[PDB]
């Protein structure tokens, strides 16, 4: 989001309450659960009004408190993790014995 | 009631539809294991300057 | 160093119990209550006779 990235858990992503969509890169996507942004406010049982609730960017940044950031900018280069390997040193030579 | 042009007194229904347009979405992308490239750098204690 | 972001969405959910008041020109509040005494000594009804 907004030139930033994080390695979130898949289920946690699927759980958070924001209107998602198919993400097929087509135009005019249809968003599911639109009620999470609009807020209708019946004042005195006289009439009804609609609000859009503004930008969730700051709240989303807070809701990533345990995530690990990576460098998506440039080449999607992940710089967090670990790896295990074993080293076969049978073929090495010292180059200095002689 | 009568003040709103309706003869019957009571509670009336009401709907409010509004077209919702999205600006600046958030993309979520998976990674497949046939396109992941680890990189290991190995350096010998050559004693280089 | 990274700026956190825009706290409007978090503010809107941090105000989830507050009461809205219309603010355009005069800040005409519409929620509240008032206690008033009604002194009806001088008050009469038309056409009793």
């Amino acid at each position, epitope marked *: 989001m907004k030139n930033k990235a994080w390695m979130v858990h898949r289920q946690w992503f699927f759980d958070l309450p924001l209107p998602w969509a198919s993400g097929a890169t087509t*135009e005019t996507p249809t968003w599911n659960r639109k009620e999470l942004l609009v807020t209708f406010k019946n004042a005195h049982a006289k009439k009804q009004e609609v609000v859009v609730l503004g930008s969730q960017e700051g709240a989303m940044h807070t809701a990533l408190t345990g995530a690990t950031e990576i460098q998506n900018s440039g080449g999607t280069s992940i710089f967090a993790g670990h790896l295990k390997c074993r080293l076969k040193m049978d073929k090495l030579e010292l180059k200095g014995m002689s | 009631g009568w003040g709103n042009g309706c003869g019957l007194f009571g509670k009336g229904s009401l709907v409010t539809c509004a077209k919702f*347009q999205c*600006l*600046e979405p958030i993309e979520g992308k998976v990674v497949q294991y046939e396109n992941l490239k680890y990189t290991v750098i190995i350096t010998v204690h050559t004693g280089d300057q | 160093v990274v700026v956190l972001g825009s706290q409007e969405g978090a503010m809107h959910t941090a105000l989830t119990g507050a009461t809205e008041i219309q603010n355009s020109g005069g800040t005409s509040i519409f929620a509240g209550h008032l206690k008033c005494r009604l002194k009806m000594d001088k008050l009469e009804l038309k056409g009793m006779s």
Partner: antibody
Amino acid sequence: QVELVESGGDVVQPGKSLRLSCAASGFTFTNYAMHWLRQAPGKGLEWVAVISSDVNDKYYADSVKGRFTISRDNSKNTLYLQMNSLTPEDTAVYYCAREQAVGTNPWAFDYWGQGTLVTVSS
Amino acid sequence: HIVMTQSPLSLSVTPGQPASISCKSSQISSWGSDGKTYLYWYLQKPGQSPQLLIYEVSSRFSGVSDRFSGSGSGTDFTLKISRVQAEDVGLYYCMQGLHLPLTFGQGTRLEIK
């Protein structure tokens, strides 16, 4: 933080067509309706054309209707304006206005481009 | 094709003083479905590009100084400045967004008296 920079403005003789280009940055382009506006020197601001979020829907000002064409290259994050049958009257500083960030109107202006100058004269 | 007529064409006022600009419409720009009034006020500073001061009749836009406030209900709208500074030189073009062929006003001019 959004940046709208003009391009394509230059001199041109009457009757010779010209294609204007509005490069966009700082926001997701495909979700925003875009506009073209012009200000002739010493004259009031005059809106030219609008393209909505869906590419197909377009509208033009009647004073320039039938002479211009507006296109959206949202894959490259840029806007295209095609000016045809230019008149010596059709010389002005041309602007590129974004859709409103917050509001109710489907089309409004909140951020204006730096501006380009096109001169139609002999 | 609603035509916007502005009452003042030149407003020379000393600093630290109020100012009232009027943009009178040829038709009520009050959208029936929502009850809002779509009248916008821009300011193109000399040698600059136009900004957006009040993105409605009276709800000012973000980044705008505290003093800019509007009014008006059906056709007689106003732009009130409380205390004029030296930066207020410009052209206060009003606009109506009610109808698709939206048209600006001629735009007043403000200078320091």
